[PDB]
Structures are given as structure tokens and as C-alpha cells.
Amino acid sequence: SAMMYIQELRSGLRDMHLLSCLESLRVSLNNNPVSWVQTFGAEGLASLLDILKRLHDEKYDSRNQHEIIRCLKAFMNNKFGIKTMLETEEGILLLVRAMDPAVPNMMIDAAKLLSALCILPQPEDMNERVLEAMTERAEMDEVERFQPLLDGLKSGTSIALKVGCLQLINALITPAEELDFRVHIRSELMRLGLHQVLQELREIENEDMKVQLCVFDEQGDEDFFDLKGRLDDIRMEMDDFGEVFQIILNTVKDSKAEPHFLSILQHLLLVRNDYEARPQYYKLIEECVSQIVLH
Amino acid sequence: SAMMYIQELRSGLRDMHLLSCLESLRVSLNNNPVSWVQTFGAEGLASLLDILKRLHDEKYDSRNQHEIIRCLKAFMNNKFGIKTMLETEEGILLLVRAMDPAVPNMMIDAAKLLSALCILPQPEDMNERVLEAMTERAEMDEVERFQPLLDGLKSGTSIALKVGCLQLINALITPAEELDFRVHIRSELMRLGLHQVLQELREIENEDMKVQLCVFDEQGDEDFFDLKGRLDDIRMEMDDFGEVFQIILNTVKDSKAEPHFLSILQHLLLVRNDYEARPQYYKLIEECVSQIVLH
Amino acid sequence: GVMDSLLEALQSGAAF
Amino acid sequence: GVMDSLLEALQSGAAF
């Protein structure tokens, strides 16, 4: 029954003839029980991913890769599936690889495909797996790990794309137990220009887009608050250069974090003394960094 | 001869009838000698500015204020004129006040009107007068002192507006003797989003727009270089927390600049210890602040 | 059919 | 006519 497809992928299929075979495969997956999916198992899943990477390598047939994504969604739509997608090496990585501004629909299907893994309860820290894998692609071609998620938040993009961006961002924020983490990557985002564009993502009136912001803003705010609660204390104690150096030496000294901090400081200390508006100047950077860590 | 106009402004003129009188006034100014302009002198100039502010107060007749700008340009087009515009109180301030995205042409005429004052040789630091005056308007309504110059660098704006923006920016950068100053306000700009838009101001192919960037980039670069020359030394000496604290105490201690610096530091020191990616995190802010002070 | 339940409860997200 | 000379030598700026 199932074997018929496993061979079809291995039998060196190609543009157009592949597409067809892939379509039928999806539809067969969806319109079947759970036990028929098992028989496709790891072996079948395997071959699907092989074609993906092989198809990525090459540089008419975006439609060809897309169907393998849809196949996966269909395949993963159950216990067995996702689990066995998770056991793979390049599984989660290739889903990520499918994201991009150039093929709106594929990214759409790739994003929510990952998002549903994040908010998975029992395989703890799935958001960590996703974020790791998200990183690994940013070197093959050497651009930043988030620029996909921001590319699909411009002028031109399908308003359905935008929902799937911020939709992923939430799944890559909510289950994260460490507050430091969430503000970290949220600041990563806004460094690329999320705050420059997030203005426009309220101007658009939508039903499914604004159940997203109503969980994002809910977070970006319940973090900001809780963070002051910690900063406010630091406004009290670290009142003193002494209190600063005291902490700098104890925590930012013999931890790889040092040469970074050292640099930050070196940059800060650049504006020579006798600059009349130096108070004003440092005031300016004050708000810069403050916007960066808080807003 | 000249008196005839001086009375015309004082005689409580109004919409449409004012416009007419203002047009003729401009054209008379332009098509006259230098001695006829003297007779209009301070008294006449005076009344022109009175109408301006009076016209600003109020909230069909943008065309009305504009003509007073053109009148000034015409009036200032010589020795005598500019000098006597400079002797005023609210002179330079009102020119600034004329800048805005809402009335493309007026701002156009207001900008270059100021720009030509900056690059004035003998009344030293005219760029300082302009920048001071530029500030004072940012409180009447409480928005930032540069957002005009950036508003006119968007989607929608006349490509002639854009030339007059970056055109002013150059006049408010080149004659400034202190390097610290130029990077200061350049960073002020880019904080509002100049680097986000300056991308687009090369995409447009223009003849007069790209004699601007060929003086701006010439600056933004001959500053960046020269600044490293100073930073590089600081990469050598301040190799050590000791060397940092040593300098922090000597220069950032009893100078109003303190409570700013103190804050910067407090923000930096927020990310609690045990955050696994804390090295990564500080790495991120590294580039943020580094982009801010250098790029 | 499972990951659909996780998908709707995503746009209309009560899985938070 | 003076501030015109400062104006052209602005777009085509040799007053730097």
C-alpha cells in the first residue's frame, strides 16, 4: 500500500512528474487512517527531506518543494508524525530553510509548521531546538538569523504572511521560562527594525492578525513591567560608582562575557572631555541603550 | 518709495489681499538696487516677521506665509539683508518654524535659506545659532528637534524636498570644528531612522541629490576613520577594568555627565548572571552601541 | 488530525 | 544678489 510511494521518491523523479506524485502523496496522507501513516514511517519521511535539501542546493519549481512541506504538515498532523519528524537530523532545520520572502506561501506553511512544535508541551524547550536550527541557516548564506521573519513584514507582502511571522515570534517567546531570554531576542528583532515596522502592523485592521498582537503586546508589557521591578532595585543599590565596579568585577570579570562588556565601555568612553554638550551627548545614548534594553 | 510697503503690512491686511501685497513686495525687492532694500531696513523686515508668528499662532493660506519666506530670501540676497536678519530676535527661529512636511515648498525654501547662513564665513559658528534655534521649536509642540528633517525623507515627498533636507544636514555638519559634535548629531539623526532611510536616497538617481551624498559620505567617512584613530588607542590602553575605572573616575565623576553614564551602566548590568547566552547577549548590545557610536 | 488543533489554537491562540 | 551664489555653490557645493 504505502511502499508504492516510498519507491516513487527514490526512483529519481523530476520537475512536473515529481509535482504530480507529490500532490497525490499529500492527498493520500490526509485522506487515510493513522496506521497507514505509520507504514510510511521514518523511511518514507526520510526520502521527502532528501529531495528538499537536494532541491535547495540547486540555483518554475518552487511549487515542487512546497508540496513536500504540505506533505509534512499532513504527515505530522498526529502523534506518530511530529515525533518521527523530531527524531531526524535535518528535519526541523529544513522546515526553517523553507522560510523566505521569495515564495510567500511556502514560508507561510513553514512558519506555522514550526510554531506548532514550539508550543508542544512534553518535548521540553522545543523553542530552543527551533532557535538553534534557525541560527544554522544564517551562515550557508551569511545574513542574520531573523531577517526572514522581518522581510515578511514590509510593503508588498501578503497580509497572511505577516500573521505567520509574528505568529512564530510568539511561539518563540511564550514558552521561554527565562525573562532574560525573551527581552534578549525581542531586542535582537528590534535591532533589525521590528519597532520601525510594528507601527504598521496595527494600522492594518484584521481579525487573525490582532489575536497575535494581543498576545505579543501582552508579553512585551508583562516583561517590561517585571524587568523594571528588577531595574528599580538596581536604581537603588547601584547608586554609586563603587556599587557598579563592585558588581562589574564580581560578575563581568571571569566569564566570557568580559571582552564584550569591555568593548561596550570603550565605545562609551570615546567622546573626549571638553565637548561642551557631552552631558547632552551621554543623555542621548542613555535613551538609545535604554530603549534597547527596555522598550 | 519703500515706506509704502512698510505701512501696508501694519495696516492689518488679510487673506487674499495680503497675498497680493506680498507678491508685489517680493518682486519689488528682487527687481531693485541695493539702496532700495536699505530703506526697507529693519523696520520693514520687522513687520514681515510679525505676520509670520501671528500667522503661525492660528489653527487656504499656507501660500500667505510662504511669500514672506520668499520675501526674506529676496531681502537677504545681499550683504545688508542677512546681517539685519541676524540682528533680530525671532529671525532665524521663524525660518526654522517654516520647515515641515505639510507644505513641501515652504520647508524647501526655509531649509536652503538657513543652509546659506551656516556656511557663512565671518559670523562664526552660525551652525550653532541655527541648531539652538532648531531646538527651541521642538517644545511648543513637544516632538524631537530633527523629525522635520527626517519627515521629508519618506515615501510621498517631492524629490526636491529630500535634496533640501540632506542639504541642510551638510551645512549643519561641515563647518563644525569639533569631531565629537558631528558624530553626536549624526547619531541623533540615525536614532530617529536616518540609516533606515538613507538606503533609499541612493536608489534614486539624481544630479543635485548626489552632489549632497558626495559631501555627506565624504564626511561620515573622514569622521569614522579619524574616530578609530582615537578608539584604536583606547583599544590599546583601556585593556583593563582598572584602566576603565581609572578613566571613569577621573572624567565621568564630577561633571554633570555622571548620572547619565551611571544609568547607561545600570541598564547594561541588568541581564542577570545565570543566563546561558549572556555572553551572546552582551555581544548583541556590543554591536548596537558600536553601530551607534561609529556607524 | 492533531496539529490542526494546535494550528487554530494558534491564530486564535489559547495555547499560551 | 549674493545668497544665490551661496545657494548654487550648495547643491553643487564647493563651499565646504
User: Grid coordinates in use for C2?
Assistant: 492533531
Q: How many whole angstroms separate alpha carbon A264 and alpha carbon A268?
A: 6
- CB within 8 Å of A170: residues ≥ 6 apart: A115, A212, A215, A216, A219, C13, C16
| Residue A260 amino acid letter | H
| Residue B105 amino acid letter | N
Q: How many whole angstroms separate alpha carbon A242 and alpha carbon A244?
A: 5
Looking at CA atoms only, how far is residue D2 from chain B in angstroms? Answer: 5
Residue B211 and residue D3: Cβ atoms within 8 Å? no
Taking alpha carbons only, the member of B87, B86, B114, B85 closest to residue B99 is: B114
Q: How far is CA A129 from the centre of its chain?
A: 10
Question: What is the phi/psi pair of residue A223, to 5°?
Answer: -90, -60
Q: How many whole angstroms separate alpha carbon B260 and alpha carbon B257?
A: 6
Q: How many whole angstroms separate alpha carbon A191 and alpha carbon A194?
A: 7
Q: In chain A, where are the structural domains located?
A: 1-227, 228-295
Q: How many whole angstroms separate alpha carbon C11 and alpha carbon A171?
A: 11
| Structure-derived torsion over alpha carbons of residues A58, A60, A65, A71, reported in degrees to the nearest 10 | -160
- CB within 8 Å of A17: residues ≥ 6 apart: none
**Do A178 and B277 meet the contact criterion of CB atoms below 8 Å apart?**
no
Going by the DSSP 8-state scheme, the letter that residue B241 receives in this structure is: H
Taking alpha carbons only, the member of A159, A173, A174, A171 closest to residue A207 is: A159
Q: How many whole angstroms separate alpha carbon C11 and alpha carbon A290?
A: 32
User: Grid coordinates in use for B9?
Assistant: 503690512
Angle between helices A79-87 and A35-57 (to 10 degrees): 40
**Do B234 and A269 meet the contact criterion of CB atoms below 8 Å apart?**
yes
| Distances in whole angstroms, Cα of residue B222 to Cα of each of B183, B215, B217, B218, B236 | 11, 10, 8, 6, 22
Count Cβ atoms below 10 Å from residue A92 Cβ, excluding itself.
21
Q: For chain D, say whether B211 makes contact (Cβ under 8 Å).
A: yes
Q: How many whole angstroms separate alpha carbon A109 and alpha carbon A61?
A: 16
Sign of CA dihedral B84, B86, B92, B95: positive
Q: For chain C, say whether A93 makes contact (Cβ under 8 Å).
A: no
Count Cβ atoms below 10 Å from residue A74 Cβ, excluding itself.
21
Q: How many whole angstroms separate alpha carbon B80 and alpha carbon B71?
A: 14
User: Grid coordinates in use for C3?
Assistant: 496539529
Taking alpha carbons only, the member of B266, B252, B170, B253 closest to residue B218 is: B170
Q: How many whole angstroms separate alpha carbon A193 and alpha carbon A108?
A: 21
Residue B208 and residue D11: Cβ atoms within 8 Å? yes
Q: How many whole angstroms separate alpha carbon B49 and alpha carbon B95?
A: 9
Count Cβ atoms below 10 Å from residue A98 Cβ, excluding itself.
24
- For an interface test with B, give the residue of D4, D8, D11, D12 to mutate (most B CBs within 10 A): D11
User: Grid coordinates in use for A93?
Assistant: 532545520
**Do B6 and B45 meet the contact criterion of CB atoms below 8 Å apart?**
no
Taking alpha carbons only, the member of A103, A14, A116 closest to residue A66 is: A103
Enumerate long-range contacts of B241-245, CB under 8 Å, 24 or more apart. Answer: B241/A245, B241/A248, B241/A249, B241/A253, B241/A262, B244/A262, B244/A265, B244/A266, B244/A269, B245/A241, B245/A245
**Residue B90 CB-density burial (10 A; 0-12 exposed, 13-18 middle, 19+ buried):** middle
Terminal-residue alpha carbon distance, chain D: 21
User: Grid coordinates in use for A172?
Assistant: 518563540
Minimum Cα–Cα distance from A79: chain C residue: C2
**Residue B111 CB-density burial (10 A; 0-12 exposed, 13-18 middle, 19+ buried):** buried
Q: How many whole angstroms separate alpha carbon B210 and alpha carbon B203?
A: 11
Going by the DSSP 8-state scheme, the letter that residue A154 receives in this structure is: S
Q: How many whole angstroms separate alpha carbon B159 and alpha carbon A88?
A: 54
- From which experimental method does this structure derive? X-ray
Angle between helices B3-10 and B17-30 (to 10 degrees): 150
On the CB side of B22, how many CA atoms lie within 13 Å of its CA? Answer: 26
Beta strands (DSSP E) in B179-287 are none
**Do A65 and A55 meet the contact criterion of CB atoms below 8 Å apart?**
yes
Q: In sequence order, which ranges of chain A are alpha helices (DSSP H)?
A: 3-10, 17-30, 35-57, 62-76, 79-87, 91-98, 104-118, 126-140, 147-151, 159-171, 179-192, 194-197, 200-203, 213-237, 241-251, 258-268, 278-293
| Distances in whole angstroms, Cα of residue B147 to Cα of each of B143, B189, B194, B280 | 8, 8, 10, 34
Q: How many whole angstroms separate alpha carbon D9 and alpha carbon D16?
A: 9
- The string of DSSP letters for A55-105 reads HHH----HHHHHHHHHHHHHHHSSHHHHHHHHHSSSHHHHHHHH--TTSHH
User: Grid coordinates in use for A89?
Assistant: 537530523
User: Grid coordinates in use for A171?
Assistant: 511561539
Taking alpha carbons only, the member of B59, B50, B39 closest to residue B13 is: B50
Q: How many whole angstroms separate alpha carbon B109 and alpha carbon B113?
A: 6
User: Grid coordinates in use for B54?
Assistant: 501671528
Count Cβ atoms below 10 Å from residue B175 Cβ, excluding itself.
18
- For an interface test with C, give the residue of A85, A112, A216, A223 to mutate (most C CBs within 10 A): A112
Q: How far is CA A55 from the centre of its chain?
A: 22
Q: How many whole angstroms separate alpha carbon B206 and alpha carbon B199?
A: 14
Question: Between chain A and chain C, how many beta carbons pairs sit less than 8 Å apart?
Answer: 41
User: Grid coordinates in use for B229?
Assistant: 584613530
- CB within 8 Å of B176: residues ≥ 6 apart: B127, B182
Taking alpha carbons only, the member of B110, B111, B94, B116 closest to residue B46 is: B94
- CB within 8 Å of B287: residues ≥ 6 apart: A191
Angle between helices A62-76 and A17-30 (to 10 degrees): 20
Residue C1 and residue A77: Cβ atoms within 8 Å? yes
Tell me how far apart the 2 most distant CA atoms of chain D are, in Å.
Answer: 21
Going by the DSSP 8-state scheme, the letter that residue A210 receives in this structure is: G
Taking alpha carbons only, the member of B267, B260, B280, B241 closest to residue A260 is: B280
Name which of A247, A277, A290 is nearest B267 (Cβ-Cβ): A290
Q: How many whole angstroms separate alpha carbon B285 and alpha carbon B184?
A: 19
The CATH number of B228-295, from 3.30.420.40, 1.10.238.150, 3.40.605.10, 2.60.40.10, is: 1.10.238.150
**Do B124 and B181 meet the contact criterion of CB atoms below 8 Å apart?**
no
| Distances in whole angstroms, Cα of residue A260 to Cα of each of A181, A273, B105 | 18, 24, 48
Taking alpha carbons only, the member of B126, B47, B62, B128 closest to residue B97 is: B62
Superfamily the domain A1-227 falls into: Leucine-rich Repeat Variant (1.25.10.10)
| Residue A283 amino acid letter | K
Q: For chain A, say whether C12 makes contact (Cβ under 8 Å).
A: yes
Q: How many whole angstroms separate alpha carbon B190 and alpha carbon B196?
A: 8
Q: For chain A, say whether C5 makes contact (Cβ under 8 Å).
A: no
Looking at CA atoms only, how far is residue A8 from chain C in angstroms? Answer: 25
**Do B252 and A278 meet the contact criterion of CB atoms below 8 Å apart?**
no
Taking alpha carbons only, the member of A135, A37, A128, A153 closest to residue A93 is: A135
Count Cβ atoms below 10 Å from residue B12 Cβ, excluding itself.
7
| Structure-derived torsion over alpha carbons of residues A234, A240, A245, A250, reported in degrees to the nearest 10 | -40
Q: How many whole angstroms separate alpha carbon D3 and alpha carbon D9?
A: 10
Q: Compute and round to an integer the Cα radius of gyration of chain B.
A: 24
Count Cβ atoms below 10 Å from residue A102 Cβ, excluding itself.
8
Angle between helices B17-30 and B62-76 (to 10 degrees): 20
Helix/strand number for chain C, H first, E second: 1, 0
Chain C partners within 8 Å of A215 (Cβ): 13, 16
Question: What is the phi/psi pair of residue A143, to 5°?
Answer: -95, 160
User: Grid coordinates in use for B118?
Assistant: 551656516
Task: Please name the chains neighbouring D, where neighbouring means 3+ C-beta pairs under 8 angstroms.
Answer: B
Report B:215-234 residues touching A (Cβ under 8 A): 227, 230-231, 234
Q: Do C and B touch (≥3 CB pairs < 8 Å)?
A: no
| 3-state SS class at A177 | coil
Name which of A234, A253, A275 is nearest B266 (Cβ-Cβ): A234
Q: For chain C, say whether A95 makes contact (Cβ under 8 Å).
A: no
**Do B252 and B261 meet the contact criterion of CB atoms below 8 Å apart?**
yes
